[PDB]
Amino acid sequence: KELGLEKDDKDAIEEKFRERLKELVVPKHVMDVVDEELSKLGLLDNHSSEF
């Protein structure tokens, strides 16, 4: 975990879409809406069907 697998987070998915968001001027409407599901998705377990 600390040395080998230093990954396992949505931050890869997140951050790649953020590379999109930089060019894609998202509306403030959607910068606000997105991060809520983002925070929920970060809370959720890797294996829940809800996740």
Add this chain to the structure above:
Amino acid sequence: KELGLEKDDKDAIEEKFRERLKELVVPKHVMDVVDEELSKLGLLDNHSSEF
């Protein structure tokens, strides 16, 4: 040294999958899809129903 045992993990399964893929030439599309899903499999528990 603290693991021992055979590689009786999903990488056995990934390895049959990937040599499979080594013969047939996939589009990079399906390549990246199978790879990211492959890692997600590897995170998944060895016994979970979703696994």
